Design an enzyme around this catalytic site. Structure first.
Site, PDB file in Angstrom:
ATOM      1  N   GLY A 136       0.840  -1.186   0.000  1.00 30.87           N
ATOM      2  CA  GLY A 136       0.000   0.000   0.000  1.00 30.87           C
ATOM      3  C   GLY A 136       0.876   1.237   0.000  1.00 30.87           C
ATOM      4  O   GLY A 136       1.965   1.229  -0.582  1.00 30.87           O
ATOM      5  N   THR A 137       0.421   2.293   0.667  1.00 32.00           N
ATOM      6  CA  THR A 137       1.105   3.584   0.591  1.00 32.00           C
ATOM      7  C   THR A 137       0.823   4.527   1.776  1.00 32.00           C
ATOM      8  O   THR A 137       1.123   5.722   1.710  1.00 32.00           O
ATOM      9  CB  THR A 137       0.747   4.276  -0.746  1.00 32.00           C
ATOM     10  N   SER A 138       0.278   3.985   2.863  1.00 34.24           N
ATOM     11  CA  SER A 138      -0.083   4.782   4.035  1.00 34.24           C
ATOM     12  C   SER A 138       1.067   4.796   5.033  1.00 34.24           C
ATOM     13  O   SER A 138       1.104   4.011   5.984  1.00 34.24           O
ATOM     14  CB  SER A 138      -1.360   4.245   4.684  1.00 34.24           C
ATOM     15  N   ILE A 139       2.006   5.701   4.793  1.00 35.68           N
ATOM     16  CA  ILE A 139       3.174   5.862   5.643  1.00 35.68           C
ATOM     17  C   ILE A 139       3.479   7.338   5.774  1.00 35.68           C
ATOM     18  O   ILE A 139       3.213   8.113   4.855  1.00 35.68           O
ATOM     19  CB  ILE A 139       4.406   5.159   5.048  1.00 35.68           C
TER      20      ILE A 139
END
Ligand code: CL
Ligand code: CL
Ligand code: MG
Ligand code: MG
Ligand code: MG
Ligand code: MG
Ligand code: MG
EC number: 3.4.25.1
Lengths: 191, 204, 222, 233, 212, 222, 222, 233, 191
Positions: free
Chosen positions: A9-12
C-alpha cells in the site's frame, strides 16, 4: 509492480517535531484483495537512529533496506556514525539506478545531534526530497501533538483506503533514544 | 491496401483568360502492374467537365451517377447545368456517403454559359469544396503537381499558352510518380469550343 | 486552423485564418472558415473541413425554416442547441469544432462547441491547432468593456499569433462583426500579411514545347 | 458487456435446524476505495425470504426494484396474497435465476452473485445461489466472493453435510456466521467492520439485525512483531 | 527495379534498369545498378541499395587480396562464395540483397551466381531479379538461345528490361548494358527508356496497345 | 515506449554547374506543428571545399556532420595534409552511414563541391549509405514538390524543340551560377507556399575554386 | 497445496498436505512437502514443486558447510536470508513459496518467504492454494501461549480445512515439531483421513489374456 | 527505456540587448498531482550560466550532480579557473548535449528538455535547447513543453528576429517573461503560481530571483458566466 | 472517457445544512494537460430549486442534464413541482441505462419545503445514494459554517489536483430562494 506480488500500500508518514522525528504507518499487506499480513512492520531500522518507511513492493523495499543497512554498517566501521542525508543518498542511489526493475517508495527519517530530526522522501522515480514532513501541521510540535497528527492522518487513510488497515505503528526518534508505539483499531477508528 | 493509391492517376485543372483547362494521365494499374493506357479520368456533362482520381471503380461509378443526375436536372430545369451548381451537387453526393465514402479526388472545370466566367473546383473524398482562382490538383502525384503548378502558373494565360503550362505541369509531375503516366490528355475549354489533345510522354 | 471569438460592448466579433491543410500540404491558401448560419448568426469552424461546412449548413437550413415558421428572427441558443445535439448524437465522429456567435432579440452571444457535443460560454474563446497561440494573446490583452475597434484588433492579433507560430494556420485573416441593431459585416480578407513575393523568373514556355500525338474537337453541344 | 464499478463483497449463509441465516457487510467499494458505508445488501421479500446480493451495486438496486415490483404484481387480483398464494423463496429464486441467465445470454449480464435464503410454506429451508452466468447451486452453506474461500470452510465445520442440519441450533449457527464475518474483516481488503444479519425461522419468522459490528478481535500480538526477519528492535 | 544476366556463346550479358522509389515517389532515374567489382567481375543491385553497394565493393577488396596472395585471378565460384558466406553470418539481422555475380574465367568459362541475403547461392544460365523480373523472364525464355550473337544478345537484354520498364511501375528511367568477356567486361551504354520505347515500337512493330 | 527518432522537417537542395556547385537549404527547424527556430543552419562548410547537409532528424544530422568534419581532420593528419577529394569524401560518408546500418542515421545527406577536374559535383546519400553522383538533387520534406521542377528546368526533361514534332529534345547545357540561384529561390518560394514545414529563410552555400561563399534570402514565416 | 506454521511455548510446528497436482490431475497422492534444511530447521514449501525442493536443498547444503566452517549450529535467520536473496535474484521465476521454521541457540522462529523474495514474521502463517481455508481456521482458533499439543492440533486442523475445502490440497497431513532443547520430530503421515475404500471387484486378469508377438531375455550383466 | 514519474513543466527564456532571461515554476507533478512545491528547476553553473530543466525530476537531479562535478573537475590543476579558463555556457551546453545524445543512442534517455542560458566571455548571449533525443536548436526565444505553444508566441511579439534583440531592454524582457508565466498558470494544468527567474547580464552579472508569484490576474469576469448556453440563472 | 474529449475533473460537492443545501465546485475543464476553460460553471439548474454538480465527461453530463431539465419541466406542467428524489431518479435512469456509453458522475441537490435540503449522489455505475453530504462535517450547520466547509475542502483539492483549479462556485438552496456565491484564488489559496 509484478503480477500477484506482495504490495505494501502507501499509508506511511514521517513528521519532524521539537525533540526529533516520528515515523508512522499502518500494518496491511495485500495480494489483490487478500490481506497477506495484517500486522506488518513497515518501519525498518537501517541504523541506530535512522529508520525508514516502506511502500510499494515488499520484496523490493526489503532488498533495498537490507543493502542500505549493509552500507551504513560498513560506513560506521570506517568513518563513524553517518548522517540521515547520507542514508537517504544510498537509498536514492539504489532506487534511481534500478528504477526500471523496482517499485519502491521510501521515506527516510533520522536523528542527529547537530541536525536534529530530518525527513527525506524517495518516490518511485528515484528522486530525493528533504522535507519537514511526508506522507495544518506546524513546525516544532510536541511529541504528543505529533503523535495525534500521525494518528488522525493514518486513521483517515485506513478509513477510505482498502490497501490500508490493521494497527498504526509509530517509531519515535529522539536524543533520549528510540521508542516504539502502537495503536489498535478500537482506539483510532472512533476518532 | 490504400484505395486512393491502388490504381493511381492524376488530374490537374487550370484557369486562363476566358478559358479553362483540365488534364489527366491515362494509366490504370493494380499496384505495380500496369493494366490500361487508355483509362481516361475526365468526363463531361454538357459543358461542365469533371476529372476524377482515386479508386477506379468509384471513378466509373461516380461518372455514371453524375450522368444520371445531370440528365434528370436537364429534363426538369429545361437547361444544362452550370459549374457552380454542379460543384455543389458533387459535394452533396459525396457527403451523403460520409461514413462509407467513395475513394476519389474529383475536379470540376468549366465556363459559366451566362456570365462567361471560368470556374474550377476540387474536392476531398467527403465533398469539401476547394474553390480556386489559379489551379486544382488531384491524384497520387498531387504533391508533384502542387510544386509544378505553383512555380509555372501565372494568371490570364491565353488558351495556346495555358495548354503548354498545364501540359508541362502534368508531364513532369507524372514522371516523378510511379503510379501515374502511360499517356495524357488535355482539354482546352473556351466559351463555345473545346479542343482535346493527347500528349506524347515516356511510357514507363 | 486558428479561430477566435471576442465579445464587446454592443456585440461580438469572430475571426479565422484561411489555410486548409492536407497533412503537411497546404491544399487551399485562402479558404473561408467563417460560416453564415443566419444573417446575424455566424460560425467559425475548425477540425474536419467537410464536417464544419455540412453541419453549419444543415443547422442553418433548419434555422431558416424555423424562423419562417415562428415569424421571428433566429436565436443563437437555438443554433447552439441544434448543433450540440447533432454532434453529440455522432459521438465525436463529426469532427466539427465550432465557435458560434451572433445577435438576436435577446442580445449578443458567444459560444464554443466541441465535436463531442460540449458547449462553453465566454467573453473570449479560441479553437483549433493555433488555439494556444491565440489564447496566449487573448489572456494577455483582453479586458472587460472593449469597443468594436478594440475587439477587432484583439481578434485579428490572436489569429496572427496562430498564423506565424502555428504551422497548421496561415495566409490571411477573415473577420465578421455582429453588432446589435445593425447588419452583420463580413470582412473577407481583412488582413493579407502573407502576399507571395515576385518570382525571379517567368516560366512561360515557348509554344510548341509540348509534344503532341493527336488533336480533336470535343462536342459539348446537343 | 460491462465492467463493475461500485461493488459489494462476500455474502455468507447457512442452514440450521429450523431455518436459515444470511449476512453481508454494509460496504460499497470503488476499486480500492471504501466509499459508501451505508449500503444494505440484504433485501427482505415478504416475511419469509431474504435476498443477499454481492457484486455491482447499481445492478443490485435494479434487482431490488424487480423484487419490490414482484410483490406488488403478486397482490394483483389475489385475495390470498398474504396467505396461500403469497410469494415463496423458491418462486423468487427461480425468477431471478431466469433473469440472470437471460441477461448473460444477451451478453449484458447483471454483475452479481446472489443468495436467496428463506423458509417455504411447508417449513422446509431454502438456500440457493445464482450468479451473473446464471449458474445455480444449493448447499447447507453458501458464500460469495471471499466468503467462498474463507467462510465456507468455517461454516462446513458446523454443518459438513445434510444430516448435521437438525443438530445445529440458531445460537450455534449465528455464532459461526458472526465469527466468519470477523475473519473476513481480518483478511478481505474490500470488507468493513459494520454488517447486517438476517434469520428466517419457521417458528419465530424473519428477524432482521442491522448495525452490527465485528468485535472480540485479536490485535495485541502485533506489538511483539518487529521487522521482517533479522531486526531485533 | 529489374535486373537480368544470362550466359551465352559469347560470354555474359548484364542488363538493368535505373529507377529508385521511396513508396510512390520516384527518388532517382539515374541509379547505377551494376556494381563494377573489378575489371573482370560484375554484380547487380536489388533489394537494399546500400547492402549491395557496400558489400560488393568490399567483395572487390577481397578479390584483390586473393590475387595478390595467390598470383592468379579469382574464380567466380570463389568470389561469389565469399559474399554468400558473409551475408549468411548476418542472417536474421535484416540485410536485403538479391544479386548476380558475373564473370568469365579460363577454368569455368562464363559463369553466373545468384546470391541472396538469406544465404542462397545458385549457379545458373539465366537469372532475373526485382519487382519486374517476371516481365523480363518472359521475353528471355521465349527468345533465348545459346548460339546468340553478341549483337543479338545485347538487344535481347535491352528489350527484356524495356518490357519490365513498361509494365512494372517501379522499373524504368534508363537501361544500362554490359558484355562480359574473358578479357573483362565492356560497357554498352546508357539508354533512356523514354526514347528507347518509341524507337523499338516503330522498328519492331511491338506495343500496338500503345498510341504513338 | 521511447521512440529515439524525430522529424525536424526542413528541405535541402544541391545543384551542380560546370565550374561551381550549390547546396541550399531552408533555415526553419520544426517539431510537429511548432516552430523551434526560424534560423537554424543545416548546410555546413566541412573543409577542403566540401559543403554538407544531413536533413531529417536533426540530432542524427548534427552527429553525422560532426563526424565527417572530424574525418576530414584526421585525413590530413594521417596523409600529410592531402586534400580530400569530393569522391573520397562520398565513399567515407558511405562507411559512416553504413556503420550504423542496424540503427541508422535518419537523414538524407547531400554534399557538394568540385571534382578533381575542377567540375561541379553533387553527391546524395540514403539513410544507410547508398550514394550516387548527380547534377541535381532535392532532399527532405518538400523534395517531392521541388524535384520534378528541377527535372524540367535543369535537365530540360519533357521539353522538346519547337516545330520538330517532338522528335528533337531540348539540348542539355550547363547553367550559370545566376540562373541556378534563380531556380533555387523559386523552388523554395514555391515549396514554402504548399508545404507547412518549409519557410522562414533560405541559406545557399556556393562552391567555386576560389572558396565557399554564402547567400541568405528571407522566406514566408507562416 | 496447503502449508502452515504455528508457534507455541517452547517451540514451533509446521504442517502440510500431501497432494501434488498436474493441472486437474493428481500426480502424487502422498508427496513430502516438508523439507529438512538443517536438523532443527525445517521448511514447508508450496508453489512449483521442483523449485521448492531445489532451493531448500541448495540453501541446506550451504547451511551445512557454514555450520562446519563456524563450528556452530545453524540459525533460521541464516536460512531465511540465503533463501530470500536467492529468490529475489530470480525475480519470482523460481516459484517457491515457503514457510521456514526451526530452533537455534537464539530461540524458536517462524517465517514465510514468497517467490519474489519478501519475508514475513508471525505466530501463525499459511501458504498455498488452501491458505485461505487454513487461515480461516487459524484466525478462529489461534491464541497466545499455546502448548505443543494444542499447536499440533491447530496446525493439523488448519491443513484439514484445506484438504476438504480446497481442490488443490488433499490426502494426508504431515507435521514436524521443533521444540527447544530437543531433537526435532518429523511426523510423516500424522493423519490419514483419506484412505481408499475397498474396490467392488478384483481386476486381476487370467494369465494369457494379453496377446504377445515376441519374447526375449535381456542381458543386464557384463 | 523509461517512463517519467515526477515531472517539471515549461521552461521559458529569451534574449535581450545585454543578456538572457530564463524562468520555470517550482513544481514537481506526479501525473495529475501537484506533489512537490519546493522544486528548483533553474541551476546556476558559475556566475555566467543557468541551466533550466523540464521533464523527469530524478534525471534532473542527476544532471545537477554532473554540472556540480563539472565545476569541481574544471578547477583541478587550473590556476585560471575563476578567469580565462572558467566554464562557459557553450562548454556546459555541449557537454550536456553530448550526454543527452549518448543516452538516447543507448536507448536509456534522460527524460528532459533543457535550456542553457548564459553570457559568454566576449559578452555574447548564449541560449540553446537540448532534449532527451539529443536534438539541439537556438533561437531568440526558447521554451519547453507548453511554453513552446503559449509562451513563444508572446515572447516572439517582443523579439520576432535577431535584429530586435538590441532594441529589447531587460525591463521589457522581464515583463514579457512574467506575463508568459501568468498565461501558463491560467492554461497549463501542470503548473504552479510560484516560480523562479534568472537574469544573466554582461554588465550586472547573474541575478537569481526566487519565490516569485503570478499576480495581477483576471478572474472577476467569471461571476457573469452562468451555465453552458441557455441557462439564465 | 473518449480520447481528447473535454473532462470536467471531479472536485464537486453538496452539503446539507440547517436552512437547506449548498452545492460547490471548481471551474477547471481540461483536454489532457491543457485547461480548455478556467471559468466553467459546473453547477447546473434542472429546476427552480433542484440543481446538480457535474463531473467526468462534459458532453455527456450536459446532454443528460438537458434531458433531465426537459423531464422535470414536463413533470411540473402535469403533476406540479417534483421532489429532489424524483430528479435523482431521472438522472439515474439515464446514467444507468446508458452506462456503457457515458462517463458522468453527478450530484443532485435540492430544496423542498417538506423534505428540506436533500443530497443524492450518482456515480459512474448508475447507482443512487442519498446522503447528508457528498464529494469532519456536523449535522445542522449554519450557512456560514457550511460555506467555510466547502471552501476549505475544495481549496485543498485544487491545491493537490491539477484537474482542479480556478474559482470556487457555490449555489445556496433555501426557502428564501437561490443565491450564487463565488470565491477567487487570492482568497481561498492562502487559507
Ligand atoms: Cl514487509
Ligand atoms: Cl462544462
Ligand atoms: Mg511514372
Ligand atoms: Mg513502369
Ligand atoms: Mg510555409
Ligand atoms: Mg481438496
Ligand atoms: Mg491547481
Amino acid at each position: 509492480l509484478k503480477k500477484g506480488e506482495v504490495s505494501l500500500g502507501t499509508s506511511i508518514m514521517a513528521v519532524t517535531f521539537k525533540d526529533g522525528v516520528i515515523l508512522g504507518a499502518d500494518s496491511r499487506t495485500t495480494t489483490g484483495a487478500y490481506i497477506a499480513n495484517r500486522v506488518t512492520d513497515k518501519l525498518t531500522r537501517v541504523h541506530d537512529k535512522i529508520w525508514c518507511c516502506r511502500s510499494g513492493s515488499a520484496a523490493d523495499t526489503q532488498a533495498i533496506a537490507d543493502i542500505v543497512q549493509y552500507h551504513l554498517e560498513l560506513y560506521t566501521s570506517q568513518y563513524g556514525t553517518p548522517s540521515t542525508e547520507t542514508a537517504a543518498s544510498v537509498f536514492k542511489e539504489l532506487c534511481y539506478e534500478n528504477k526500471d526493475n523496482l517499485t519502491a517508495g521510501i521515506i527516510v527519517a533520522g536523528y542527529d545531534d547537530k541536525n536534529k530530526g530530518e525527513v527525506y522522501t524517495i518516490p518511485l522515480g528515484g528522486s530525493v526530497h528533504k522535507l519537514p514532513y511526508a506522507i495544518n501541521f506546524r513546525e516544532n510540535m510536541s511529541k504528543e501533538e505529533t503523535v495525534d497528527f500521525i494518528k488522525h492522518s493514518l486513521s483517515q487513510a485506513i478509513k477510505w483506503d482498502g490497501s490500508s488497515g490493521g494497527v498504526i505503528r509509530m517509531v519515535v526518534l529522539t536524543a533520549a533514544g528510540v521508542e516504539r508505539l502502537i495503536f489498535y483499531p478500537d482506539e483510532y477508528e472512533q476518532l | 491496401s490504400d484505395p486512393s493509391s491502388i490504381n493511381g492517376g492524376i488530374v490537374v485543372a487550370m484557369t486562363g483568360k476566358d478559358c479553362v483547362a483540365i488534364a489527366c494521365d491515362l494509366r490504370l494499374g493494380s499496384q505495380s502492374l500496369g493494366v490500361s493506357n487508355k483509362f481516361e479520368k475526365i468526363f463531361h456533362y454538357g459543358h461542365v467537365f469533371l476529372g476524377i482520381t482515386g479508386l477506379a471503380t468509384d471513378v466509373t461509378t461516380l461518372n455514371e451517377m453524375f450522368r444520371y443526375k445531370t440528365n434528370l436536372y436537364k429534363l426538369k430545369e429545361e437547361r444544362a447545368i452550370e459549374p457552380e451548381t454542379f460543384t455543389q451537387l458533387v459535394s452533396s453526393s459525396l457527403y451523403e456517403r460520409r461514413f462509407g465514402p467513395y475513394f476519389v479526388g474529383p475536379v470540376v472545370a468549366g465556363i459559366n454559359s451566362k456570365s462567361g466566367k471560368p470556374f474550377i473546383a476540387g474536392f476531398d473524398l467527403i465533398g469539401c469544396i476547394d474553390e480556386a482562382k489559379d489551379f486544382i490538383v488531384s491524384g497520387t502525384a498531387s504533391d508533384q503537381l502542387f510544386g509544378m503548378c505553383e512555380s509555372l502558373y501565372e494568371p490570364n494565360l491565353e488558351p495556346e499558352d495555358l495548354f503548354e503550362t498545364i501540359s508541362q505541369a502534368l508531364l513532369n509531375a507524372a514522371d516523378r510518380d510511379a503510379l501515374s503516366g502511360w499517356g495524357a490528355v488535355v482539354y482546352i475549354i473556351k466559351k463555345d469550343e473545346v479542343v482535346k489533345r493527347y500528349l506524347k510522354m515516356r511510357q514507363d | 486552423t486558428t479561430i477566435v471569438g471576442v465579445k464587446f460592448n454592443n456585440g461580438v466579433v469572430i475571426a479565422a485564418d484561411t489555410r486548409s491543410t492536407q497533412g503537411p500540404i497546404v491544399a487551399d491558401k485562402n479558404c473561408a472558415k467563417l460560416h453564415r448560419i443566419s444573417p446575424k448568426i455566424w460560425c467559425a469552424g475548425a477540425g474536419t473541413a467537410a464536417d464544419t461546412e455540412a453541419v453549419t449548413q444543415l443547422i442553418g437550413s433548419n434555422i431558416e425554416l424555423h424562423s419562417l415558421y415562428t415569424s421571428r428572427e433566429p436565436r443563437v441558443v437555438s443554433a447552439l442547441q441544434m448543433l450540440k445535439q447533432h454532434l453529440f448524437k455522432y459521438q465525436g465522429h463529426i469532427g466539427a469544432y465550432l465557435i458560434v456567435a451572433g445577435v438576436d432579440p435577446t442580445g449578443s452571444h458567444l459560444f464554443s462547441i466541441h465535436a463531442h457535443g460540449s458547449t462553453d460560454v465566454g467573453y473570449y474563446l479560441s479553437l483549433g491547432s493555433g488555439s494556444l497561440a491565440a489564447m496566449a494573446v487573448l489572456e494577455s490583452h483582453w479586458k472587460q468593456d472593449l469597443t468594436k475597434e478594440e475587439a477587432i484588433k484583439l481578434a485579428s492579433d490572436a489569429i496572427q499569433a496562430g498564423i506565424w507560430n502555428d504551422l497548421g494556420s496561415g495566409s490571411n485573416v477573415d473577420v465578421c462583426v455582429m453588432e446589435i441593431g445593425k447588419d452583420a459585416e463580413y470582412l473577407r480578407n481583412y488582413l493579407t500579411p502573407n502576399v507571395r513575393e515576385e518570382k525571379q523568373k517567368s516560366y512561360k514556355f515557348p509554344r510548341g514545347t509540348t509534344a503532341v500525338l493527336k488533336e480533336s474537337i470535343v462536342n459539348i453541344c446537343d | 458487456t460491462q465492467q463493475p464499478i461500485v461493488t459489494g463483497t462476500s455474502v455468507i449463509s447457512m442452514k440450521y435446524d429450523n431455518g436459515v441465516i444470511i449476512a453481508a457487510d454494509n460496504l460499497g467499494s470503488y476499486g480500492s476505495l471504501l466509499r459508501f458505508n451505508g449500503v444494505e445488501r440484504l433485501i427482505p421479500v415478504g416475511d419469509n425470504t431474504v435476498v443477499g446480493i454481492s457484486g455491482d451495486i447499481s445492478d443490485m438496486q435494479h434487482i431490488e426494484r424487480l423484487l419490490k415490483d414482484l410483490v406488488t404484481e403478486n397482490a394483483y387480483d389475489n385475495p390470498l396474497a398474504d396467505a396461500e398464494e403469497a410469494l415463496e423463496p423458491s418462486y423468487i429464486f427461480e425468477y431471478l435465476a431466469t433473469v440472470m441467465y437471460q441477461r448473460r445470454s444477451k451478453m449484458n449480464p447483471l454483475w452479481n452473485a446472489i443468495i436467496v435464503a428463506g423458509v417455504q410454506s411447508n417449513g422446509d429451508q431454502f438456500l440457493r445461489y445464482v450468479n451473473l452466468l446464471g449458474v445455480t447451486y444449493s448447499s447447507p452453506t453458501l458464500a460469495t466472493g471471499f466468503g467462498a474461500h474463507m467462510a465456507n470452510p468455517l461454516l462446513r465445520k458446523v454443518v459438513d453435510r445434510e444430516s448435521d442440519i437438525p443438530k445445529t441450533t440458531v445460537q450455534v449457527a449465528e455464532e459461526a456466521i458472526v465469527n466468519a464475518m470477523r475473519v473476513l474483516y481480518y483478511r478481505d481488503a474490500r470488507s468493513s467492520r459494520n454488517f447486517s444479519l438476517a434469520i428466517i425461522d419457521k417458528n419465530t419468522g424473519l428477524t432482521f439485525k442491522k448495525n452490527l459490528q465485528v468485535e472480540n478481535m485479536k490485535w495485541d500480538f502485533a506489538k511483539d512483531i518487529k521487522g521482517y526477519g533479522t531486526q531485533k528492535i | 527495379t529489374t535486373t537480368l544476366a544470362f550466359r551465352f556463346q559469347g560470354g555474359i550479358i548484364v542488363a538493368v534498369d535505373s529507377r529508385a522509389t521511396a513508396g510512390n515517389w520516384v527518388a532517382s532515374q539515374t541509379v547505377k545498378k551494376v556494381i563494377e567489382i573489378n575489371p573482370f567481375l560484375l554484380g547487380t543491385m536489388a533489394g537494399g541499395a546500400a547492402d549491395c553497394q557496400f558489400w560488393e565493393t568490399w567483395l572487390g577488396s577481397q578479390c584483390r587480396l586473393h590475387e595478390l596472395r595467390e598470383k592468379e585471378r579469382i574464380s567466380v565460384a570463389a568470389a561469389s562464395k565469399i559474399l554468400s558466406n558473409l551475408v549468411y553470418q548476418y542472417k536474421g539481422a535484416g540485410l536485403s540483397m538479391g544479386t548476380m555475380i558475373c564473370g568469365y574465367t579460363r577454368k569455368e568459362g562464363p559463369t553466373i551466381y545468384y546470391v541472396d541475403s538469406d544465404g542462397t547461392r545458385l549457379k545458373g544460365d539465366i537469372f532475373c531479379v526485382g519487382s519486374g523480373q517476371t516481365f523480363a523472364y518472359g521475353v528471355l525464355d521465349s527468345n533465348y538461345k545459346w548460339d546468340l550473337s553478341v549483337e543479338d544478345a545485347l538487344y535481347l537484354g535491352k528489350r527484356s528490361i524495356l518490357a519490365a520498364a513498361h509494365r512494372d511501375a517501379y522499373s524504368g528511367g534508363s537501361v544500362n548494358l554490359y558484355h562480359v568477356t574473358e578479357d573483362g567486361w565492356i560497357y554498352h551504354g546508357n539508354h533512356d527508356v523514354g526514347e528507347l520505347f518509341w524507337k523499338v515500337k516503330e522498328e519492331e512493330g511491338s506495343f500496338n496497345n500503345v498510341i504513338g | 515506449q521511447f521512440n529515439p527518432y524525430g522529424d525536424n522537417g526542413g528541405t535541402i537542395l544541391g545543384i551542380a554547374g560546370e565550374d561551381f556547385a550549390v547546396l541550399a537549404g531552408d533555415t526553419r527547424n520544426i517539431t510537429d506543428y511548432s516552430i523551434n527556430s526560424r534560423y537554424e543552419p543545416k548546410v555546413f562548410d566541412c573543409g577542403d571545399n566540401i559543403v554538407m547537409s544531413a536533413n531529417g532528424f536533426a540530432a542524427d544530422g548534427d552527429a553525422l556532420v560532426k563526424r565527417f568534419k572530424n574525418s576530414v581532420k584526421w585525413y590530413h593528419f594521417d596523409h600529410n595534409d592531402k586534400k580530400l577529394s569530393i569522391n573520397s569524401a562520398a565513399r567515407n560518408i558511405q562507411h559512416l552511414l553504413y556503420g550504423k546500418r542496424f540503427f541508422p542515421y535518419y537523414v538524407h545527406t547531400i554534399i557538394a563541391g568540385l571534382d578533381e577536374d575542377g567540375k561541379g559535383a553533387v553527391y546524395s546519400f540514403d539513410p544507410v549509405g547508398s550514394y550516387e553522383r548527380e547534377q541535381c538533387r532535392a532532399g527532405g520534406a518538400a523534395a517531392s514538390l521541388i524535384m520534378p521542377f528541377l527535372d524540367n528546368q535543369v535537365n530540360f526533361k519533357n521539353q522538346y524543340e519547337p516545330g520538330t514534332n517532338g522528335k528533337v529534345k531540348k539540348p542539355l547545357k550547363y547553367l550559370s551560377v545566376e540562373e541556378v540561384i534563380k531556380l533555387v529561390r523559386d523552388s523554395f518560394t514555391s515549396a514554402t507556399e504548399r508545404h507547412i514545414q518549409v519557410g522562414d529563410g533560405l541559406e545557399i552555400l556556393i562552391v567555386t575554386k576560389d572558396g565557399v561563399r554564402k547567400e541568405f534570402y528571407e522566406l514566408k514565416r507562416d
